[PDB]
Amino acid sequence: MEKSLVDTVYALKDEVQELRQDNKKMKKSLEEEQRARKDLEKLVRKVLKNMND
Amino acid sequence: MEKSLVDTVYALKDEVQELRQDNKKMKKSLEEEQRARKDLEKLVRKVLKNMNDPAWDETNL
Amino acid sequence: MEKSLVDTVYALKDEVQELRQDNKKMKKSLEEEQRARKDLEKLVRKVLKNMNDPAWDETNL
Amino acid sequence: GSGSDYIIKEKTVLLQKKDSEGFGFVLRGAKAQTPIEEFTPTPAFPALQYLESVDEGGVAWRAGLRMGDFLIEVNGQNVVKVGHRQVVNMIRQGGNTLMVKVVMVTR
Numbered sequence: 001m002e003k004s005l006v007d008t009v010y011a012l013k014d015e016v017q018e019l020r021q022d023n024k025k026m027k028k029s030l031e032e033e034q035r036a037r038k039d040l041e042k043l044v045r046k047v048l049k050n051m052n053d
Numbered sequence: 054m055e056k057s058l059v060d061t062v063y064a065l066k067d068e069v070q071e072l073r074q075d076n077k078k079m080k081k082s083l084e085e086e087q088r089a090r091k092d093l094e095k096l097v098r099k100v101l102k103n104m105n106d107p108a109w110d111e112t113n114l
Numbered sequence: 115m116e117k118s119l120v121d122t123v124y125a126l127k128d129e130v131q132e133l134r135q136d137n138k139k140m141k142k143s144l145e146e147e148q149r150a151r152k153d154l155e156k157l158v159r160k161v162l163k164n165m166n167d168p169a170w171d172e173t174n175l
Numbered sequence: 176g177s178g179s180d181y182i183i184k185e186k187t188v189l190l191q192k193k194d195s196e197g198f199g200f201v202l203r204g205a206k207a208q209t210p211i212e213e214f215t216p217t218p219a220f221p222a223l224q225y226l227e228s229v230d231e232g233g234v235a236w237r238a239g240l241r242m243g244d245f246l247i248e249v250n251g252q253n254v255v256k257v258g259h260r261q262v263v264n265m266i267r268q269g270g271n272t273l274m275v276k277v278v279m280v281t282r
Contacts, residue, residue, distance in 0.1 A: 001119060003055055004062045009122055012062075012069055016129050019072055023136045026080060030143055033086055037147070040094055041154045047097070047104050048161050052170060054120075061123060068130050075137055082144050090151055093158055100158075100165065169212070171259040172227065173202045175266055 180282060183218065185247070187276035188238035198273060199233020200226050200240060202266070207258025214256055221245035221278055222255040224262050244277040 103109075115121050164170075190198050204224030205212055216222070224246040229235045246262060247255055250269055254262040266273060 003117075003119055004058050004123060006119065008062055008066065009119065009126065012065055013122060013126050013129075015069055015073070016126060016133060019069070019076060019133055020129075020136075022076055022080075023133065023140060026076075026083060026140065027136075029083060029087075030140070030147065033083070033090065034147060037086075037090055037151055037154065040090060040097065041150075041157075043101065044097055044154065044157055044161065047101050048157060051104070051161070051164065052168070058120065058123060061127060065123075065126060065130055068134070072130070072133055072137065075141075079137075079140055079144060082148075086144065086147055086151060093151075093155055097158055100161065103165070169205055170203065171206050173259070173263050175198050175200055175202055175263070 181218070182279060182281040184279040185276065186239055186279065187248075187274075188240060190234050190238055190240075190273040190275065192234045192271050194271060196234070198235045199230035200235040201228035202246070202259070202263065203227035204246070204259045204262070206260050207256075208261060210258070216255060221280075222247055223257065224254065224259055226277070240275075240277065241279065244279055246275065246277050248276040250274045 115124060192198055202224055203226075204222070207223065212223075222245045226235070226240060226242055226244045226246065229240050229242055229244075247253070249262055249265045250273070252265060254265065257265075
């Protein structure tokens with residue numbers, strides 16, 4: 001328990017812990033955006049191919 | 054291996070910091086996308102609100 | 115390895131390389147997401163150019 | 176048997192009408208003269224113009240012309256890749272007379 005800086009290791013273990021939790025929320029959001037984007041991207045081809053044709 | 058261990062820890066501090074900042078960037082990039090779209094959304098809404106039930110000048114109302 | 119520290123460290127080392135990857139994937143996704151949002155804007159943009167000046171004309175003969 | 180077939184015809188008709196009437200059809204298609212549009216006369220969209228509507232009982236109908244029939248030639252000049260506002264101007268030139276060649280497409 002003398003080697004390394006010791007406390008920094010657990011403090012680090014701690015943030016990386018937080019970091020990973022985040023990637024999950026962002027990965028979550030990213031995917032939620034992608035659904036909204038496409039939902040909109042559909043809503044547009046309506047007033048795209050239709051219009052006057 | 055003792056010096057080698059210290060060495061590693063310091064490098065992870067650097068590495069962990071790089072991720073810390075890289076996450077703030079992304080969380081931010083992701084926020085532009087969120088807004089950018091909702092804008093398209095609002096615009097398109099106007100458009101889409103002109104299609105069904107036409108509105109194009111001369112004696113509109 | 116055989117001490118609580120030496121291993122806690124080689125674990126994080128591992129954990130950190132994972133988060134590095136999840137990031138290269140994350141960054142690549144927003145990128146795609148962005149190039150896909152901007153192309154929808156080009157549709158919307160051109161759906162507009164036609165709302166205004168059609169290019170399609172009609173004549174009774 | 177649902178594969179995919181076409182009946183790409185190519186009838187040519189002769190039209191005339193009294194100043195007291197019109198050939199009886201709505202011409203629709205892309206303008207031009209200085210286009211940025213696509214010019215691919217593929218077996219899909221024969222020509223820029225086409226008969227969007229043909230009045231039932233009027234001249235154009237009394238000569239086979241029908242809805243969908245793409246406008247290939249107005250008298251002489253080949254109008255397949257000519258702009259709307261141009262193909263029109265032509266059509267008029269021939270006052271109350273109009274020689275035209277178009278093509279039907281069944282599916």
